[PDB]
XYZ file of N, CA and C in Angstrom:
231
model
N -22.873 18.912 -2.178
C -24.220 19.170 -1.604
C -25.132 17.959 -1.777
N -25.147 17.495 -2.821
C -26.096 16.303 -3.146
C -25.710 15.304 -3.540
N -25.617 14.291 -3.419
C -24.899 12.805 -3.479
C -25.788 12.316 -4.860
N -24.730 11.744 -5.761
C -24.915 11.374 -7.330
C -24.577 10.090 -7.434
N -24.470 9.435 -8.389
C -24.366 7.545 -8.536
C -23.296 7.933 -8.935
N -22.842 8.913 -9.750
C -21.022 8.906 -10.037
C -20.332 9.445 -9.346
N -20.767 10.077 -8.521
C -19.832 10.879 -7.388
C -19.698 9.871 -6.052
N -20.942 8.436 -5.909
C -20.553 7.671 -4.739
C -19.545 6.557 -5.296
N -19.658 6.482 -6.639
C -18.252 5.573 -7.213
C -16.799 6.252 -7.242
N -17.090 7.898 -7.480
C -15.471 8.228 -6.726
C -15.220 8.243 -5.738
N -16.287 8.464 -4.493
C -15.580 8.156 -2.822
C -15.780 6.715 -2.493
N -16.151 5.840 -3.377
C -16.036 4.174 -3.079
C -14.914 3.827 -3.527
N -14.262 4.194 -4.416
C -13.041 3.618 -4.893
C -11.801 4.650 -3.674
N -12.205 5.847 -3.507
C -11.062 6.215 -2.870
C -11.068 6.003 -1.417
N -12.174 5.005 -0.886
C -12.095 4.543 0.451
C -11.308 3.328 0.469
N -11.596 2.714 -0.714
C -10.596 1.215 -0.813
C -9.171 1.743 -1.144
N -9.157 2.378 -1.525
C -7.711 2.551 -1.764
C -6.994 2.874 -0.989
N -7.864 3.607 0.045
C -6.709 4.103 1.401
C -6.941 2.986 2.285
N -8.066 2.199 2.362
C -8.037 0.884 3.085
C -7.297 -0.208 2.930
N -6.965 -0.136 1.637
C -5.708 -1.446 1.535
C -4.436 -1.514 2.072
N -4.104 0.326 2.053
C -3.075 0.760 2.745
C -2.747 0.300 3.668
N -4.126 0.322 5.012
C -4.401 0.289 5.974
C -4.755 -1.646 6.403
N -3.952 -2.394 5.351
C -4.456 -3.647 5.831
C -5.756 -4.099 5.741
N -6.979 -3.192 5.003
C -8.087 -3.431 5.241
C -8.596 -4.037 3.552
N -7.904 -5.400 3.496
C -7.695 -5.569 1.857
C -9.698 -6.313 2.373
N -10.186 -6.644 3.150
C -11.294 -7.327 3.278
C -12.125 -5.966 2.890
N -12.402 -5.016 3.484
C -13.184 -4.092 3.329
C -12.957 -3.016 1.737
N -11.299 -3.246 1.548
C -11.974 -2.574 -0.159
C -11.921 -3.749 -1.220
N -12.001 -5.004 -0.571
C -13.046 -5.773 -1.849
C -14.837 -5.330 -1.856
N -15.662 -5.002 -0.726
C -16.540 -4.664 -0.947
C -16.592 -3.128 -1.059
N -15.828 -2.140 -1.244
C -15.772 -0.800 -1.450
C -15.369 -0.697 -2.874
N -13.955 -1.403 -3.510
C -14.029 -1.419 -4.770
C -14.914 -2.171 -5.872
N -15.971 -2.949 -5.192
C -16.905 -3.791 -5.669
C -18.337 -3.046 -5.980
N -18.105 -2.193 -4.586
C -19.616 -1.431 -4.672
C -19.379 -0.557 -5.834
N -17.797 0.228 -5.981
C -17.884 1.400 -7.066
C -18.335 1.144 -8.006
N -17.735 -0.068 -8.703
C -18.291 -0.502 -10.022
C -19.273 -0.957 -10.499
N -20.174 -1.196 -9.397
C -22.042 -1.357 -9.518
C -22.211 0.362 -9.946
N -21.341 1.231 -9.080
C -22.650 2.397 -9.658
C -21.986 2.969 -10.711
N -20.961 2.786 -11.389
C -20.500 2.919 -12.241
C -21.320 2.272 -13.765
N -21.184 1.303 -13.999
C -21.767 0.214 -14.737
C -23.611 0.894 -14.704
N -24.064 1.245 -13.629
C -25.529 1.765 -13.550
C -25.646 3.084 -14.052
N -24.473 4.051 -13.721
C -24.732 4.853 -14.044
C -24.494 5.074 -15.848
N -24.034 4.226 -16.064
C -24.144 4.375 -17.906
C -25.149 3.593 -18.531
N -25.881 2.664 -17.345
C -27.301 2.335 -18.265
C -28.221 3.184 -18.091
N -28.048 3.617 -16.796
C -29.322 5.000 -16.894
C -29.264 6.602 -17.573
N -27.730 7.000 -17.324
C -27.556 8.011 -17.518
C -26.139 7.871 -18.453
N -27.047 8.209 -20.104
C -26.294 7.232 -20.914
C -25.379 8.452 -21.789
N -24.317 9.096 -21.376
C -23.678 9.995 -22.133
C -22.755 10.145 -23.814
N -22.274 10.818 -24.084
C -21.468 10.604 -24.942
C -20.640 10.063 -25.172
N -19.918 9.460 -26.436
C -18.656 8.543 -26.274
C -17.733 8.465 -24.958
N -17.458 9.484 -25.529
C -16.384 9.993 -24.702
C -16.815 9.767 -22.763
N -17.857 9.808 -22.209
C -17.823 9.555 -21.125
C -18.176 8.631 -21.135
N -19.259 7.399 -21.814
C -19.129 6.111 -22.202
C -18.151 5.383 -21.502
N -17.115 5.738 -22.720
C -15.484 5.027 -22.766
C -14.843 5.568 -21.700
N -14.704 6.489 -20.952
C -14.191 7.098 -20.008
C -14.929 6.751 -18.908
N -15.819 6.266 -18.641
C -16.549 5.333 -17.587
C -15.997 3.808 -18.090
N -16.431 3.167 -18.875
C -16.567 1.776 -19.148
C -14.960 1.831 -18.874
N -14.116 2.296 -19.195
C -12.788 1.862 -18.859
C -12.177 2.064 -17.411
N -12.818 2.761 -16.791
C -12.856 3.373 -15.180
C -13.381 1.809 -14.556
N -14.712 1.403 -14.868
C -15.074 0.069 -14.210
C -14.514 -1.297 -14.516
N -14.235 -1.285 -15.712
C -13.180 -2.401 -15.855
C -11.725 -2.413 -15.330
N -11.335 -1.147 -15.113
C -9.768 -1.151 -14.620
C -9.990 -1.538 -12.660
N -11.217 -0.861 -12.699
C -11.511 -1.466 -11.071
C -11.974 -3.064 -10.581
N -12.414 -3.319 -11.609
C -12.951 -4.633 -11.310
C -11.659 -5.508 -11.226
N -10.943 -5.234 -12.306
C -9.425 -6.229 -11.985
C -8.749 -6.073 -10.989
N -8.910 -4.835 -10.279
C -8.279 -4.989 -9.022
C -8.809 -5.363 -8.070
N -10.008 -5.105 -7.925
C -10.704 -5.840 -6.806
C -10.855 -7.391 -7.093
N -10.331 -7.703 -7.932
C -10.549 -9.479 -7.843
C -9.128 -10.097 -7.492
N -7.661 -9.096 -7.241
C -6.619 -9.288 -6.967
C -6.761 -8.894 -5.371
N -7.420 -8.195 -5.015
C -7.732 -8.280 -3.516
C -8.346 -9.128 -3.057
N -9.302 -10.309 -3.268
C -9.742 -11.101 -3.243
C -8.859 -12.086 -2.703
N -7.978 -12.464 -3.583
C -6.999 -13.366 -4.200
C -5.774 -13.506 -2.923
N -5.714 -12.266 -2.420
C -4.524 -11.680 -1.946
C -5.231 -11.654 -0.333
N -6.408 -11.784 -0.018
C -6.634 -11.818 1.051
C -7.209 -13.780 1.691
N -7.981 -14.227 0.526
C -7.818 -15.016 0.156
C -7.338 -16.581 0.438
N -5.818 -15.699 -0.079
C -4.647 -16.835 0.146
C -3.955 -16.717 1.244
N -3.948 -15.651 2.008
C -3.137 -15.194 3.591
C -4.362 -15.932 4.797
């Protein structure tokens, strides 16, 4: 019903992911790029318990490494 800063980082990451599929390695560098802005925001503003902390902070770092291998990979072709 209502669109959240952590709920547009799960349909940003799962648009890149079906876009890479799709050859579209240009468009989920800026889809897996955008997730991890609202990711990263959403734990300075909306600052939870360890546990979702670490369960975020490890969500945006595991994305960021991939989106810099899409980079790389589009890149060099």
């Amino acid at each position: 019903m209502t669109t959240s800063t952590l709920q547009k980082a799960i349909d940003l990451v799962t648009k890149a992911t079906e876009e890479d599929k799709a050859k579209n390695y240009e468009e989920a560098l800026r889809l897996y790029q955008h997730a991890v802005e609202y990711f990263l925001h959403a734990i300075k503003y909306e600052a939870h318990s360890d546990k979702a902390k670490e369960s975020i902070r490890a969500k945006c770092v595991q994305y960021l490494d991939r989106a810099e291998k899409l980079k790389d990979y589009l890149r060099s072709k």
